[PDB]
Amino acid sequence: EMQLTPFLILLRKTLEQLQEKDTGNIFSEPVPLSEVPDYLDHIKKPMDFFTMKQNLEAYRYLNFDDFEEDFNLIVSNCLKYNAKDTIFYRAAVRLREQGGAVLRQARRQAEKM
Ligand SMILES: O=C1CNc2ccc(Br)cc2N1
């Protein structure tokens, strides 16, 4: 029960803040199937921030949970694919932690709308 434009403005700002936590930019674009050709063998729905931006502008995120779901997919795919002792796995743990705080604050703002 809110206006669309300010909500999407909020989601754009939030997506920017999540990308800011991915300082290595390892989640900015789809996992390169050229360098990881077996990636799709158990990752049923790849996700990344560029795809999220396209989903956002295509009006596919009309509530906070659908936006947060795809962010969680970025995290969960990375934990699933990579061994625990890798930089990638620890980066997803850190993104889960730092992104979670970004998301909680953003959701508080959406709920005021
Ligand atoms: O799981 C991942 C996350 N992103 C990524 C970027 C480049 C390369 Br190479 C591998 C990965 N794997």
UniProtKB/Swiss-Prot annotation:
Scaffold subunit of various histone acetyltransferase (HAT) complexes, such as the MOZ/MORF and HBO1 complexes, which have a histone H3 acetyltransferase activity. Plays a key role in HBO1 complex by directing KAT7/HBO1 specificity towards histone H3 'Lys-14' acetylation (H3K14ac). Some HAT complexes preferentially mediate histone H3 'Lys-23' (H3K23ac) acetylation. Positively regulates the transcription of RUNX1 and RUNX2. This is Peregrin. Acetylated by KAT6A. The chain holds residues 627 to 739 of 1214 of the full protein. The gene is BRPF1. Component of some HBO1 complex composed of KAT7/HBO1, MEAF6, ING5, and BRPF1. Component of the MOZ/MORF complex composed at least of ING5, KAT6A, KAT6B, MEAF6 and one of BRPF1, BRD1/BRPF2 and BRPF3. Interacts (via PHD-type zinc finger domains) with unmethylated histone H3 at 'Lys-4' (H3K4me0). Interacts with trimethylated 'Lys-36' of histone H3 (H3K36me3). Interacts with ING5; interaction directs BRPF1 to H4K4me3-enriched chromatin at the 5' of active genes. Interacts with KAT7. It is linked to Intellectual developmental disorder with dysmorphic facies and ptosis: An autosomal dominant neurodevelopmental disorder characterized by delayed psychomotor development, intellectual disability, delayed language, and facial dysmorphisms, most notably ptosis. Additional features may include poor growth, hypotonia, and seizures. High levels in testis. It is found in: Nucleus; Chromosome; Cytoplasm. Residues 2-106 form the Bromo domain. Disulfide bonds: none annotated. It comes from the Eukaryota.
